[PDB]
Amino acid sequence: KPSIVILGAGYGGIVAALGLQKRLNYNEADITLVNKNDYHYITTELHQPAAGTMHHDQARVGIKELIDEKKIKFVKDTVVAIDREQQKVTLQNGELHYDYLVVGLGSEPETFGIEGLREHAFSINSINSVRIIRQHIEYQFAKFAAEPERTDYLTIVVGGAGFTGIEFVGELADRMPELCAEYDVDPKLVRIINVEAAPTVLPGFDPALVNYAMDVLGGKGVEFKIGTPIKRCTPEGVVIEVDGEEEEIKAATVVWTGGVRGNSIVEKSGFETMRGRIKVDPYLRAPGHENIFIVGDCALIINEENNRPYPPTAQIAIQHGENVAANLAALIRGGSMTPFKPHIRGTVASLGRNDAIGIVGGRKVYGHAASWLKKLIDMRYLYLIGGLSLVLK
Amino acid sequence: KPSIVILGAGYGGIVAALGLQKRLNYNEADITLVNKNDYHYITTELHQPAAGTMHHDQARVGIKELIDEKKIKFVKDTVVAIDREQQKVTLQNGELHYDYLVVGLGSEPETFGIEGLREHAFSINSINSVRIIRQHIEYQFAKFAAEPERTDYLTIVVGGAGFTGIEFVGELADRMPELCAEYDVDPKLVRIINVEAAPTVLPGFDPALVNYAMDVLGGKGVEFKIGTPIKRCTPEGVVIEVDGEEEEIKAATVVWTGGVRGNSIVEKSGFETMRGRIKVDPYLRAPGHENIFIVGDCALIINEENNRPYPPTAQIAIQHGENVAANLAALIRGGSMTPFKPHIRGTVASLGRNDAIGIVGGRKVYGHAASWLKKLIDMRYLYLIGGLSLVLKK
Ligand SMILES: Cc1cc2nc3c(=O)[nH]c(=O)nc-3n(C[C@H](O)[C@H](O)[C@H](O)COP(=O)(O)OP(=O)(O)OC[C@H]3O[C@@H](n4cnc5c(N)ncnc54)[C@H](O)[C@@H]3O)c2cc1C
Ligand SMILES: Cc1cc2nc3c(=O)[nH]c(=O)nc-3n(C[C@H](O)[C@H](O)[C@H](O)COP(=O)(O)OP(=O)(O)OC[C@H]3O[C@@H](n4cnc5c(N)ncnc54)[C@H](O)[C@@H]3O)c2cc1C
Numbered sequence A: 001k002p003s004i005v006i007l008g009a010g011y012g013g014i015v016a017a018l019g020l021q022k023r024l025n026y027n028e029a030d031i032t033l034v035n036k037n038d039y040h041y042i043t044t045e046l047h048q049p050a051a052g053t054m055h056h057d058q059a060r061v062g063i064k065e066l067i068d069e070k071k072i073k074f075v076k077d078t079v080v081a082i083d084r085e086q087q088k089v090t091l092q093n094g095e096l097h098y099d100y101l102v103v104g105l106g107s108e109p110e111t112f113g114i115e116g117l118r119e120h121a122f123s124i125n126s127i128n129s130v131r132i133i134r135q136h137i138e139y140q141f142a143k144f145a146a147e148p149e150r151t152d153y154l155t156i157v158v159g160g161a162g163f164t165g166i167e168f169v170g171e172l173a174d175r176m177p178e179l180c181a182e183y184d185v186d187p188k189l190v191r192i193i194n195v196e197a198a199p200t201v202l203p204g205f206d207p208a209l210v211n212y213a214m215d216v217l218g219g220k221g222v223e224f225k226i227g228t229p230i231k232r233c234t235p236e237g238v239v240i241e242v243d244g245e246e247e248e249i250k251a252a253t254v255v256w257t258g259g260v261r262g263n264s265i266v267e268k269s270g271f272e273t274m275r276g277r278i279k280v281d282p283y284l285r286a287p288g289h290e291n292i293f294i295v296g297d298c299a300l301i302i303n304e305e306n307n308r309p310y311p312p313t314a315q316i317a318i319q320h321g322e323n324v325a326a327n328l329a330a331l332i333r334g335g336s337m338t339p340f341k342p343h344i345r346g347t348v349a350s351l352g353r354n355d356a357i358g359i360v361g362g363r364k365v366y367g368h369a370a371s372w373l374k375k376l377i378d379m380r381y382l383y384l385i386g387g388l389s390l391v392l393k
Numbered sequence B: 001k002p003s004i005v006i007l008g009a010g011y012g013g014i015v016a017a018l019g020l021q022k023r024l025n026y027n028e029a030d031i032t033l034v035n036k037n038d039y040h041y042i043t044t045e046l047h048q049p050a051a052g053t054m055h056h057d058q059a060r061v062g063i064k065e066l067i068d069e070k071k072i073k074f075v076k077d078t079v080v081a082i083d084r085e086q087q088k089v090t091l092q093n094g095e096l097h098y099d100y101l102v103v104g105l106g107s108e109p110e111t112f113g114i115e116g117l118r119e120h121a122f123s124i125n126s127i128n129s130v131r132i133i134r135q136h137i138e139y140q141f142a143k144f145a146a147e148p149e150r151t152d153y154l155t156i157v158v159g160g161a162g163f164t165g166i167e168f169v170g171e172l173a174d175r176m177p178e179l180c181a182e183y184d185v186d187p188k189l190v191r192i193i194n195v196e197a198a199p200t201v202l203p204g205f206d207p208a209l210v211n212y213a214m215d216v217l218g219g220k221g222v223e224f225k226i227g228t229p230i231k232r233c234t235p236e237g238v239v240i241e242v243d244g245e246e247e248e249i250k251a252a253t254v255v256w257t258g259g260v261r262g263n264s265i266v267e268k269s270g271f272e273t274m275r276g277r278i279k280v281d282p283y284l285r286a287p288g289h290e291n292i293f294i295v296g297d298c299a300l301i302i303n304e305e306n307n308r309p310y311p312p313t314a315q316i317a318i319q320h321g322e323n324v325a326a327n328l329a330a331l332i333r334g335g336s337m338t339p340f341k342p343h344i345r346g347t348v349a350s351l352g353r354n355d356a357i358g359i360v361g362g363r364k365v366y367g368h369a370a371s372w373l374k375k376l377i378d379m380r381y382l383y384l385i386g387g388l389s390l391v392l393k394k
């Protein structure tokens, strides 16, 4: 009968819920899952619908289908704030109560306080957002035939050359032949620009793979501006600093992949956070709070070996949920808990539909091999939450 | 030796060129065809791509494929003005000289000086235009999911309940189930509004056909506002006058089918025009110029029997091309020419993919029968200009 509530049905949230489903026995606890939408979207593949290389429906699944209900109660609503003292959470259309709290609200875009970014730029963070990005670009290409002078319609600027930016421009480059044919556009006129403040694309990554990534993307017509930061964002385009002087790029479409931050709700609810994320204990709990757990991008963990923190990823997020699910079972049964130890296997980044790069098991991988791996790994997630049934669909 | 120049590759233009092609024996005259694009689009079917019910490629064909290269020389360029005195036409990328001139530049949207109409509203008049309208609407639906409070995204206002407007709103209603499913939208929230200044939808049409049209469209959720004029057009929406008082409609998409005028080029070239169109003589030429011919929407014709003017249509435009081609051929070859006599067969209006209305001959038509009738008649044009080969390609 205790009331555990999980906030967000993302990688951290949905796995924690499914873990609880398998682990526990009917009526042992009251579990409620809260989500903004009635569907759970595969964030790792969201860059593809934004380009238009994949339908958005292939990147999402209905939550009710995943759960058997009765054990877990699903609430479709929007979280507003956290009342920790009165162990309750407030929604736009109601209020909920928790004995135990699991926080997996994912990330929010990090704008760095840059002017006009929130107003005039797009983010790849949801099914709704990527649909908007996709239709915006196609809309812009449609307008070009009427006004051939306006080449800014055909200019797409992606801010930041992180994994998200690199994956996106790769998909974008692949789409352009089909896109140009649809709207009678000269492929040569199209400009896809990736702008990176850091001196190198994909900073903190193996130079061998990075150069390979740039080489392939450069061949597909992607343009890279490195050591160039975005100072400001305008409706017309963006403003960048080159050689200590401001320069302007006129782009009808600006996508911001500059970084991510923890959900503002967590920080605004009075938690102590760094970059909006919580530095949790070995048991994935929020300091000074024995009944609160943080999962996914909201959680922050530091590798004891080095001084740097683990990056926010789906891979570690899945591991968060499974750990919390097991630990929650122990707490409900009055048992001890197990410290969280993250096993970070290789990471693979796609460079389009048929190409990819990654370091897996210490070994570097490229080409069709890496592409098949990522497709395989992503499919493994489908099996984890939906079984062979989900993989087929 | 003589230089025949044809302006525009629309219904009037393309048929006139093809008519000359069949009629003449090469080298007899120098024929040049001028078009804004290297393709000829089926304007009668343009309402479907704008809605998104049909691909735009099915509504156009390449001009070079249709014509006999050696006999007719095709120029892809944009007409700027016509110099009647010097008998030359000026383009963005050159100049051309004519002994005989055929003008089929089609129509331009008529805004009637209404504020913001040209700036903030869309027109269904080209391949480029319908693509813009289509992607615009899908874009607004995409934004709605993020902001469910903004129901104006799902509101589409079509100005004028003429022939074009009725076809467009009919196509739109059919699209909505597929469109709503794509962007997770509640169909009940969607509003398709047709605004008519006249007291009745489809003025000057059989009330029986009109009532059927409103009934079918009304069932699909289409809303009609009649006796209501559009005072102004804004990015936010439109302003309308109801019961002598101003009212507001919030619509992300505004499409203007309120009417058309002849191409501005004809008027700016010093021609004498009414509503931008030329009232031609029985030989479809502009008074008193014996060597200039006007075809399609640019031309204005009066029915001798009923004194009322013919509406600007593709059907009469096609007949213009055939008449001018025959008359031009006769003129260079010696003939006495033939006065233009329009044979106006029935007209059919689609009310969606599976429904239609029309008066053919003396009998009124409805349902799948009318739809098949309209589809067949449209196919006749494809055969006329492209043969069985063009007909195959859908
Ligand atoms: C294009 C892209 C590609 C990526 N590829 C990879 C990859 O290949 N490998 C890898 O390891 N990582 C990848 N990542 C990173 C990974 O997707 C994130 O780290 C992952 O989303 C984190 O899991 P999460 O559940 O905490 O976040 P999320 O998946 O975003 O969980 C958010 C969920 O909580 C809901 N929610 C949020 N706020 C509220 C609120 N106020 N009220 C109600 N519901 C709310 C949301 O609707 C959503 O359902 C990628 C990220 C992006 C953008
Ligand atoms: C949705 C819609 C549905 C319709 N359905 C029917 C129907 O069912 N039956 C019927 O009889 N009529 C119908 N009509 C009307 C018909 O389409 C027109 O009346 C017909 O096109 C008139 O012939 P036209 O060649 O003069 O016009 P157009 O087809 O518009 O001729 C214009 C051509 O010349 C080109 N051009 C224009 N300006 C320039 C320029 N400055 N320089 C170079 N090239 C230029 C254009 O690109 C185009 O190729 C419909 C119209 C619309 C909008």
Ligand SMILES: NC(=O)c1ccc[n+]([C@@H]2O[C@H](COP(=O)([O-])OP(=O)(O)OC[C@H]3O[C@@H](n4cnc5c(N)ncnc54)[C@H](O)[C@@H]3O)[C@@H](O)[C@H]2O)c1
Pocket (backbone or CB within 6 Å): A112, A114, A159, A160, A161, A162, A163, A164, A165, A167, A195, A196, A197, A198, A202, A203, A228, A229, A230, A231, A257, A258, A259, A260, A311, A312, A313, A347, A348, A349, A350
């Ligand atoms: N295959 C994978 O494992 C995979 C794929 C995608 C994302 N991810 C993870 O998702 C997380 C989110 O990554 P992300 O791509 O959203 O951001 P990021 O933090 O990983 O990279 C941000 C980049 O943007 C640049 N940048 C920031 N501000 C800028 C500005 N004003 N102008 C120009 N450039 C600017 C930074 O230098 C940085 O290189 C990462 O931890 C990443 O590791 C993993």
